[PDB]
Amino acid sequence: NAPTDAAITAASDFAALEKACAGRLGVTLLDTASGRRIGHRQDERFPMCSTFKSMLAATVLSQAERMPALLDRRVPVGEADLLSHAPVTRRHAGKDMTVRDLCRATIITSDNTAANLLFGVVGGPPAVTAFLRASGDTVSRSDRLEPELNSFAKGDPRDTTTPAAMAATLQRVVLGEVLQPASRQQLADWLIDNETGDACLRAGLGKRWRVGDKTGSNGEDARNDIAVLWPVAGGAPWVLTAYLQAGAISYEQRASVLAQVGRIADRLIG
Ligand SMILES: N[C@H](CCC(=O)O)C(=O)O
């Protein structure tokens, strides 16, 4: 393990980091003031895994803007809805939860049952894709429910994005005008409160950044993290998306790769 870990630590650019883990790494670092992007494989497709949940939540928030009280609607959590990864919803089997609380749960813990219940509320993967298209993202696409959506095959575009498409979408939705201000602020706060990314991009980013993020993974080789970086001292935010497939290293080493993306990105911002 030591040589691979040492090579990951020594990598000072994204191409070298990809080589150090024998993986396929897609990164976009986006300066929201200028639109300038730096990265690696920015326009190749990668499986979203749970990174899509940011946009499922955005779809809910967008629908709530035209459906008064949607966020307060209560949705039953049934035994049949529960999946292996349901850390919040498991305590509510046999009762219900608000749509708003399901959104928070799916963002900050990646709760899979919460996501499937929200898919039922909004009209499924087609409604999330339609939201993405209407927002100006012609690339990202939601196709399946949990847990099937986490599969990937080259040439199979289901449930995929590109680093650059997702970065632009985070800008438009989390920072821009796709949602009303109170909706976008609620979504930003959920991302800021994420609990699953402590070993990923956040571990490589310094204290000058307030970070919101959403992670994803599968059991084969995928580990992802997408983030918005607000400068605590003020100024324009940055967006950092990172998609990795690296089957030759461990799950924990995949986090180390994402942390190194953060370290490289922080130095590139300056
Ligand atoms: N597929 C994982 C969620 C399920 C799990 O962690 O077991 C993710 O992308 O966050």
Side-chain angles (χ1 to χ4, degrees):
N1 260 28
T4 298
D5 303 320
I8 290 167
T9 296
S12 64
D13 57 69
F14 301 129
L17 180 56
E18 175 178 82
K19 187 175 178 189
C21 65
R24 188 174 67 102
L25 175 63
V27 172
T28 292
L29 175 64
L30 167 62
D31 172 5
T32 70
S34 67
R36 174 174 306 106
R37 292 176 285 107
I38 306 173
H40 190 71
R41 302 184 192 280
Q42 297 196 60
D43 300 287
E44 295 191 23
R45 286 191 181 270
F46 291 81
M48 279 189 286
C49 302
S50 282
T51 66
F52 88 89
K53 285 163 179 162
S54 63
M55 299 299 116
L56 173 57
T59 298
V60 175
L61 289 165
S62 182
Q63 290 188 2
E65 294 171 359
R66 55 181 195 265
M67 304 178 192
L70 176 62
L71 296 178
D72 294 309
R73 178 187 303 174
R74 285 184 164 270
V75 179
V77 178
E79 199 62 29
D81 299 305
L82 290 177
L83 297 168
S84 286
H85 186 66
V88 181
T89 55
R90 65 179 297 188
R91 291 193 175 173
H92 298 272
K95 57 179 292 300
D96 57 30
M97 289 179 48
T98 68
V99 165
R100 188 189 294 98
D101 288 357
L102 290 163
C103 286
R104 178 185 191 81
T106 206
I107 297 295
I108 75 175
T109 74
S110 222
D111 191 308
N112 281 338
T113 291
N116 282 351
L117 292 171
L118 292 170
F119 270 133
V121 169
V122 301
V128 176
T129 297
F131 168 83
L132 288 163
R133 297 288 174 276
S135 79
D137 184 340
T138 63
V139 172
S140 309
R141 48 182 290 175
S142 171
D143 294 279
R144 291 167 295 180
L145 305 176
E146 288 285 3
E148 289 73 26
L149 65 84
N150 298 285
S151 85
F152 181 76
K154 180 174 162 64
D156 181 349
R158 289 178 293 173
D159 309 288
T160 63
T161 190
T162 67
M166 185 58 76
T169 288
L170 284 175
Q171 178 181 9
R172 298 188 196 99
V173 174
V174 181
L175 303 171
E177 263 47 58
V178 172
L179 303 173
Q180 294 168 357
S183 300
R184 153 183 61 81
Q185 290 176 284
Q186 179 69 271
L187 178 59
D189 290 355
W190 288 334
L191 295 165
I192 290 162
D193 288 349
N194 180 40
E195 300 175 355
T196 65
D198 291 347
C200 296
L201 293 170
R202 284 171 191 269
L205 293 169
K207 313 282 251 191
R208 66 179 180 156
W209 303 110
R210 185 195 322 281
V211 176
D213 84 299
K214 180 73 197 78
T215 57
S217 63
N218 70 23
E220 184 169 275
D221 63 8
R223 199 155 181 192
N224 309 323
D225 196 12
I226 65 175
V228 179
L229 281 52
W230 287 271
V232 299
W238 293 67
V239 176
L240 179 54
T241 59
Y243 286 85
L244 178 68
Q245 290 187 284
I249 60 169
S250 72
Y251 177 73
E252 179 167 342
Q253 286 172 316
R254 294 171 199 147
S256 297
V257 172
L258 298 177
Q260 192 69 6
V261 170
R263 293 191 190 92
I264 294 166
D266 205 3
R267 174 190 271 260
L268 289 166
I269 297 170

